[PDB]
Amino acid sequence: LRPISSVVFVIAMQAEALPLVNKFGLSETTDSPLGKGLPWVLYHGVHKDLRINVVCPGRDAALGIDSVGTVPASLITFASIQALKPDIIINAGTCGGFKVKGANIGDVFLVSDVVFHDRRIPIPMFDLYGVGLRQAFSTPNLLKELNLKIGRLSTGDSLDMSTQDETLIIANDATLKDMEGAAVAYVADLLKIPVVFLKAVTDLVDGDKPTAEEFLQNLTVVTAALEGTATKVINFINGRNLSDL
Amino acid sequence: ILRPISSVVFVIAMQAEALPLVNKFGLSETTDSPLGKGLPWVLYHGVHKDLRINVVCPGRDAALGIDSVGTVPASLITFASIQALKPDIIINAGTCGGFKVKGANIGDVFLVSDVVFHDRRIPIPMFDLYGVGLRQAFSTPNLLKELNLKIGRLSTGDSLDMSTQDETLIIANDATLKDMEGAAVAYVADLLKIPVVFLKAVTDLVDGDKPTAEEFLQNLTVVTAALEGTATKVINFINGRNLSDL
């Protein structure tokens, strides 16, 4: 095969992208290559053997909060793949974790496989489709070298967790809970692009703090840990082919 | 210079829901992959009188062949169709559950006034309203006057069933209709500034006495014919009119 030459990061919140942007000296795109009048942000750069791009769903028109959730993440994954034809996608972001599954605040996890906990369609065939079980691209050398934790990720468009959500998340044996991962994998699967995840724990879903409060409290520090890992991930990938990880 | 509507996109989640409409207007399946290669998405195009008509579906899933329902695939095809096909107006036609307390009956084909999500709960200020994603459908007063369709709020979520948490939000948002793509089509259409209108045909009563999946499957064929019937009259009404006339 050929060495990986192009990597796209899909990152939901702009402050989580920014340190990575600055670290690799990436520039904000000016020519709206993913479509006109869109709030989306793309940062581009060439670093050693890798073209590097980072896409975010951008600041919402009303208030400028990050356009989080499965739909915007799915849109930018699709558009950036079609526009750039990367070798690999990395969906980097924050997530909730389970203490009983070994998750701690500030851990940056790799993901083995990914599901939805909030697409409940109680009809055969549709049920499995809804769950949308998908495997992350195998990166055994990356995991070993960086000494990263790993677990199943469960995706849904809510930050909190209803009773029904929790039953499905426990049943699927997830270590991690986010708001976009499985939608990224659906699009990547559709377009035959390998996908890796980097999910950084801001809050303990089985813990003694409310989710929204804990997430907001740890966001700044955990973002920094996520940048430290994503940086190492980029350097590791440089000059390797997909077989090497 | 402004002009009468020349191009319409239909976004339809299930192929069987799209076919009656395809047959009615003699549309043919595109072979040129206008939205991108290697995808399961299906596009039908044709010309009826003064209007070019595109019907797009998220396609049958690779595993078992079932319709790729839900907000993500709908929002992708909306996005790709807008960019490639450059429509004047989008119509999101599909089936939905209805609340009989809100005046909905099985076989009713509604015109949506506005749209929300009931399954994006982000209990943080600013994020909360964003998650709900309240959006107004394009104003079509004359169409409503002509066609006499019931109207009401649509509430969107990626589940066919309704958890207790979903219900609380659906009740408080005073929706008449419940579906699986609507608010996401609206989101995408807003982003790209395309007028969107919704035709939602009631297959099951969320506050009735029949299990949802069961009632939906039972009524799907007859309600799909009803939906074709309304969409046909919508297409014929739009013909020759500008946006501001509906």
- We report the CATH number of the domain holding residue A211 as 3.40.50.1580
Instruction: Return the closest-CA partner of residue A185 out of A116, A232, A122, A236.
Output: A116
Q: What is the resolution of this structure in A?
A: 2.2
Radius of gyration of chain A (CA): 17
Length, in residues, of chain A: 245
CA atoms within 13 A on the CB side of A193: 30
> What total number of domains does chain A contain?
1
Helices A70-84 + A181-190 axis angle, to 10: 30
Please count the other Cβ atoms lying within 10 Å of the Cβ belonging to residue A231: 14
B183's tokens: 């608010």
Contact yes or no for A175/A102 (Cβ under 8 A): yes
Q: What's the rounded Cα separation, in Å, for the pair A214 and A218?
A: 6
Helices B71-85 + A70-84 axis angle, to 10: 40
Could you say which residues from 94 to 123 on chain A have a Cβ atom under 8 Å away from some Cβ of chain B? 116, 118-123
Contacts of B161 in chain A (CB under 8 A): 120-122
Q: What's the rounded Cα separation, in Å, for the pair B156 and A132?
A: 19
H/E segment holding residue B29: strand B28-29
Q: What's the rounded Cα separation, in Å, for the pair B156 and A226?
A: 33
Partners of residue B121 on adjacent β-strands = none
Handedness of CA A18, A230, A137, B70 (dihedral sign): negative
- The single-letter code of the amino acid at B189 is A
- The single-letter code of the amino acid at A51 is R
Contacts of A63 in chain B (CB under 8 A): 126, 130
Instruction: Return the closest-CA partner of residue B90 out of B101, B79, B100.
Output: B79
The answer to whether residue B70 neighbours chain A at the CB level (below 8 Å) is yes
Contacts of A79 in chain B (CB under 8 A): 79
CB contact under 8 A, B79 and A82: no
Question: Quick check: is B215 catalytic?
Answer: no
Contact yes or no for B58/B73 (Cβ under 8 A): yes
**Which one-letter DSSP state was computed for residue A97?**
E
CB contact under 8 A, A158 and B61: no
Tell me how many degrees the CA angle A208-A213-A216 measures, rounded to the nearest 5. 130
Contacts of A159 in chain B (CB under 8 A): 121-124, 127
CB contact under 8 A, B61 and A35: no
Instruction: Return the closest-CA partner of residue B70 out of A216, A212, A186, A114.
Output: A186
Partners of residue B116 on adjacent β-strands = B155
Contact yes or no for A118/B119 (Cβ under 8 A): yes
Contact yes or no for B182/B113 (Cβ under 8 A): no
Question: Quick check: is A203 catalytic?
Answer: yes
CB contact under 8 A, B76 and A79: no
Please count the other Cβ atoms lying within 10 Å of the Cβ belonging to residue B2: 6
A145's tokens: 């070298």
CB contact under 8 A, A191 and B79: no
- The single-letter code of the amino acid at A221 is V
In a 10 Å sphere around its CB, with 0-12 CB exposed, 13-18 middle and 19+ buried, how is residue A133 labelled? Answer: middle
- Strands, E, within A11-164: which ranges? 27-28, 41-47, 50-56, 88-97, 108-116, 134-135, 150-155
Q: Hey, is A50 helix, strand or coil?
A: strand
Phi and psi, residue B169, nearest 5° = -75, -35
Contact yes or no for B156/B195 (Cβ under 8 A): no
Q: Which of A60, A121, A158 sits opposite B119 (nearest CB)?
A: A158
Residue A221 falls in which region: left (phi positive, over 0), alpha (psi -120 to 50) or beta: alpha
Please count the other Cβ atoms lying within 10 Å of the Cβ belonging to residue B3: 8
Instruction: Return the closest-CA partner of residue B238 out of B202, B195, B191, B177.
Output: B195
* Choice among B114, B119, B204, B215 that is catalytic: B204
Provide the residue range defining the domain that includes A84: 1-245
Partners of residue B56 on adjacent β-strands = B11, B43
> Experimental method used, please?
X-ray
Q: Hey, is B155 helix, strand or coil?
A: strand
In a 10 Å sphere around its CB, with 0-12 CB exposed, 13-18 middle and 19+ buried, how is residue A67 labelled? Answer: buried
Q: What's the rounded Cα separation, in Å, for the pair A185 and B192?
A: 24
Q: Is A60 marked within a binding site? A: no
Contacts of B119 in chain A (CB under 8 A): 118, 156-158
Q: Is A23 marked within a binding site? A: no
Contact yes or no for A122/B161 (Cβ under 8 A): yes
Closest Cα of chain B to A223: distance in Å?
19
Q: What's the rounded Cα separation, in Å, for the pair A158 and B224?
A: 32
Q: What's the rounded Cα separation, in Å, for the pair B29 and A203?
A: 48
Q: What's the rounded Cα separation, in Å, for the pair B211 and B162?
A: 11
Q: What's the rounded Cα separation, in Å, for the pair A214 and A94?
A: 12
Q: What's the rounded Cα separation, in Å, for the pair A96 and A101?
A: 12
Q: Is B67 marked within a binding site? A: no
Contact yes or no for B198/B137 (Cβ under 8 A): yes
Q: Which of A116, A122, A163 sits opposite B161 (nearest CB)?
A: A122
Q: Is A125 marked within a binding site? A: no
Q: What's the rounded Cα separation, in Å, for the pair B84 and B92?
A: 17
Tokens 């070994």 correspond to A102
**Which one-letter DSSP state was computed for residue B62?**
T
Radius of gyration of chain B (CA): 17
Contact yes or no for B73/B14 (Cβ under 8 A): no
CB contact under 8 A, B159 and A130: yes
Tokens 């006057």 correspond to B145
Instruction: Return the closest-CA partner of residue A230 out of A11, A73, A76, A3.
Output: A11
